[PDB]
Design a protein around this nucleic acid. Structure first.
Ligand SMILES: Nc1ncnc2c1ncn2[C@H]1C[C@H](O)[C@@H](COP(=O)(O)NP(=O)(O)OP(=O)(O)O)O1
Ligand SMILES: [Mg+2]
Ligand SMILES: [Mg+2]
Length: 430
DNA sequence: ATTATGACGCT
DNA sequence: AGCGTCAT
């Protein structure tokens, strides 16, 4: 009892931007603000593919992966913004630069781990300790947490007919219970972490004009889950004590890393649907079905416990460019293949050169991946070679050299390629 | 014809 | 080294 770890050692948050690519386009074009809007790529086929959707547009049922022509059927007044196109492919530079704006603000507060173009984990354990020392015995006011939800509250016994009324009542219950006394209560630490995350979210909105949501908990999985509970423009605190009720009706697929085959297996092999049901199995039983690492992870995670560290990494480990060639457009000639490789290499060269100037590093390996027609896998084949010069002509020529014997017969290229992907990796200081 | 592209585990 | 999974 006295010796059972409860996964309450850290304070971790996950900050994720709300409808991020849309906000980027709305900041730039004020006519799009506060309107049902989506961002699309490649307008020629079915009006383009939607990759981001404003919350006003979601209310009509518009979603990612939907065709714009189809989205317009659900939402006639839907406004659209097109992703920039360069060299015949989508160019996501505008969103990467916007991402940098936000990541640089978050880094001021604590160590972060970039997790995607629009989210990062934050390890607030040290910052909370410092803040706790800064205010001795200072009780925490509700005004310090104007956009925070406490998951699981309010509980027990009219302002609650509306959502802000629920939020405030739950926050009051939580704050009324908190003992400022006792610098080591995990709940107190989370609360101070939440205050700091309000400050962080305020700074991002002030300095970039972008709104975001956040989750604060004791580990990355719970912080990520918490982030999505009250999006948009709100933050949610998930305490250790909230986990049994929260996990009791939480579908297994909603937990990070369980959204694929492993999660399906868990459900299928154990005959359960919710994360909390995992507690009735022994660690050995879970290890026997899903392996040593997965079994141990599951046994601790269904109890709200996870030890994956927030890595101190702001910069991407790899830099890559890819393009799909669906259906009839699959590449069928040598020349075609070489031209598209050159287009990808030119974009890559730009991004690498910038990376070298900004971050004092150079990539040393080039990985080329291709997908052949009829193959469902992301990558049909991967090959690599040395990246010794940031030269687009050398890179595209070397990439062709490494995959040219994949061609069964021809001038002609077969089987046709439905994807080309160039990735620069193995960075070293410069 | 659900795209562009990341991190990282397994062998 | 090369492939498979899970992810936004
Ligand atoms: N499958 C995909 N393919 C291409 N781009 C994608 C993508 N999923 C996301 N993006 C791009 C476009 C997105 O804007 C961005 C962030 O991904 P989220 O955080 O998953 N989604 P958002 O921020 O939009 O809304 P909110 O978080 O409020 O739910 O990455
Ligand atoms: Mg987001
Ligand atoms: Mg995200």
């Amino acid at each position: 009892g006295p010796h059972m770890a409860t996964g309450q050692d850290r304070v971790v948050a996950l900050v994720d931007m709300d409808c991020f690519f849309v906000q980027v386009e709305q900041r730039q074009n004020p006519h799009l603000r506060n309107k049902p809007c989506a961002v699309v790529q490649y307008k020629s086929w079915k009006g383009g593919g939607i990759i981001a959707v404003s919350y006003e547009a979601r209310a009509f049922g518009v979603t990612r992966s939907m065709w714009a022509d189809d989205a317009k059927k659900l939402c006639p007044d839907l406004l659209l913004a097109q992703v920039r196109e360069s060299r015949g492919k989508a160019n996501l530079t505008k969103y990467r630069e916007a991402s940098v704006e936000v990541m640089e603000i978050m880094s001021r507060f604590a160590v972060i781990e970039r997790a995607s173009i629009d989210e990062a984990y934050v390890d607030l354990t040290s910052a909370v300790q410092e803040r706790l020392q800064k205010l001795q015995g200072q009780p925490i006011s509700a005004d310090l947490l104007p956009s925070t939800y406490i998951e699981g509250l309010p509980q027990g016994p009219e302002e609650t007919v509306q959502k802000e009324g629920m939020r405030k009542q739950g926050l009051f219950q939580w704050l009324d219970s908190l003992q400022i006394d006792n610098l080591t209560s995990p709940d107190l630490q989370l609360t101070v972490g939440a205050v700091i995350v309000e400050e962080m979210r305020a700074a991002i909105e002030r300095e970039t004009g972008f709104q975001c949501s956040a989750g604060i908990s004791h580990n990355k999985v719970l912080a990520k889950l918490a982030c999505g509970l009250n999006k948009p423009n709100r933050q949610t605190l998930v305490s250790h004590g909230s986990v049994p009720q929260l996990f009791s009706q939480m579908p297994i697929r909603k937990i990070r890393s369980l959204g694929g085959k492993l999660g399906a297996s868990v459900i299928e092999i154990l005959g359960i649907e919710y994360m909390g049901e995992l507690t009735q199995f022994t660690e050995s039983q879970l290890q026997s079905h899903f392996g040593e690492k997965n079994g141990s992870w599951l046994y601790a995670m269904c109890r709200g416990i996870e030890h994956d560290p927030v890595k101190p990494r702001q910069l991407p480990k790899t830099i890559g460019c890819s393009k799909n060639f669906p259906g009839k457009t699959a590449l069928a000639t040598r020349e075609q293949v070489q031209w598209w490789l050159l287009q990808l290499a030119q974009e890559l060269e730009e991004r690498l050169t910038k990376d070298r100037n900004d971050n004092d590093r150079v990539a040393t390996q080039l990985v080329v991946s291709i997908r052949v027609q009829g193959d469902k896998r992301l990558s049909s084949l991967r090959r690599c070679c040395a990246l010794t010069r940031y030269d687009a002509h050398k890179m595209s020529h070397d990439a062709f050299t490494v995959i040219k014997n994949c061609n069964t017969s021809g001038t002609e290229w077969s089987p046709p390629l439905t994807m080309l992907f160039l990735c620069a990796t193995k960075f070293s200081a410069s």
